[model samples]
Target: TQQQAKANGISINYEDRGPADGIPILLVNGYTSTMMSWPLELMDGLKARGFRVIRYDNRDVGRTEKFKGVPDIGEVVKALREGKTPETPYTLSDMAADGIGLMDALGIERAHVMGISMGGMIVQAMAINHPERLVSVTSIMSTTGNYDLPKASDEAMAALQQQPASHDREVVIRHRMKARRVYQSPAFPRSDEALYALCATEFDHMYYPEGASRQYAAIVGDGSRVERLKKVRVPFLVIHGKADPLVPVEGGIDTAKCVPGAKLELIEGMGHDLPVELCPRYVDLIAEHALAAGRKAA
Candidate 1:
């Protein structure tokens, strides 16, 4: 189910599924997350509706090539505070290029790109930098990095740093369980035990935490995307949870506002996480937009 390909000057681990005759859709995962971070139901739902899906690890996570050390995010923020652009190990555009490189490796010229959180930002980068390579873009629970918009709640930001001081396996599993609660969906909530099991599973697969700060630096380095977004011509869709405290709703709202001809979907009771209960909802919105893009191009 997992394979590595040389792409963008690194080895990328990915899994391609669904049917060849279906529309090609590449799944981009979020910060500090592996390709396996994608929801199983979300993947299955898209495939059921006739879509070719590819999900992969970014440069510093999963089975992909490691960048090894973490960045001093404080230094990067200091530069930002001084009104200077900060440099990161890699920016969202570099991440986007990796996805494109994977497509090239797989012999795919174009695909509908869907991303959540940081992955959402990467797909937006793809839309801006490689518009001709995307059929449509779905950015879920992500911000436009406009700087003027509201940031994540303090509670959410605090939870993000909930990495266990102790790297003991159970401690890390317990840590993730505690951290995820801060932004999980309220109405369609998954059980804490289920979340615990997932944390345990992911930790066993790939548990390096150093790569995350580098990814965080990359997010900060991408900075404000307002003007670039305004020029994006890809068929765009932004979906956010009304109760999202992490990225907040304004980010999604501003994203739709910035992009020309973009549609926004605001769902009540949903939060930062994608609940399996809502797979149908995400699939419907994404499929509609992807096929709509196909029609427009056809």
Candidate 2:
């Protein structure tokens, strides 16, 4: 069931499920993605293994509060490139606080926090700013804030800039489907029906392009966390796809190198998105990592 709680002065919509006696694990999604972006198979697998799984829509995405009057993408990107903070509604640190505040509201003092892509960066912020609230941190398909790493492929970069001018649901959905197809793992392609359904679901829930732009601004303006990541004492795991065109594998490599005692897991032929076929393997690895961290804490 989905519930809403006021965290960081905004309403956060979340779904919390699984055995009451299970250890809590909070899963954070990437840029412009909602809690729904998490594959059902992955969530169910974790729940079946006795994990209390919690997934929430981050600020400016899904059903969460949206900030108005934020600077446009071009302005924000230029400011950031000039080494100046962009004029935005909030920072990634503020988003991290929302996660912590949500945990506080639920009376969960500690949880196994996991994030992907931009979500990974947010969890890193959580570890840096509020390590005491985390039992462990799992970062997947994400990069450190380092600007020196290899960038996305030209094809992938071009896909990011593709925007359909029409707000019509079908057009938007088709555009997104095309974008996903361009970056999906070649080894685990889904059926056209599956992609269409996923895109339709997203469009029906909330089709706010403005919110996505703001999220991008937050990402571009956020600085490198490598120095702070080195100070993190929590058990950490970094998982990435060796063939990730959107975020090159180097991002994951640098992330592991920065965090003390962080383990790196690279899967061959995987891309930006998690394929359904690998759900079992991902579940096992994440659950094992969380269990080990729990044992260490004990």
lDDT (10s digit) by residue, model 1, range 125-238? 999999988889999999988888887889899988656888899988888888888899888887978897778878887998878888898898777888899999989999
Model 2 segments more than 4 A misplaced: 72-86
Q: In candidate 2, what are the lDDT values of residues 27-102, reduced to their tens digit?
A: 9889888888888899999998889998899998888888876557788768868988777778788888999988
Deviating ranges (above 4 Å) for candidate 1: none
Number of the predicted model whose TM-score against the real structure is largest = 1
Which residue pairs collide in model 1, if any?
A: none
TM-score of 2: 0.96
TM-score of each: 0.97, 0.96
- The pairs that clash in candidate 2 are none
Instruction: Please report, in order, the local distance difference test score of every candidate based on alpha carbons.
Output: 0.89, 0.88
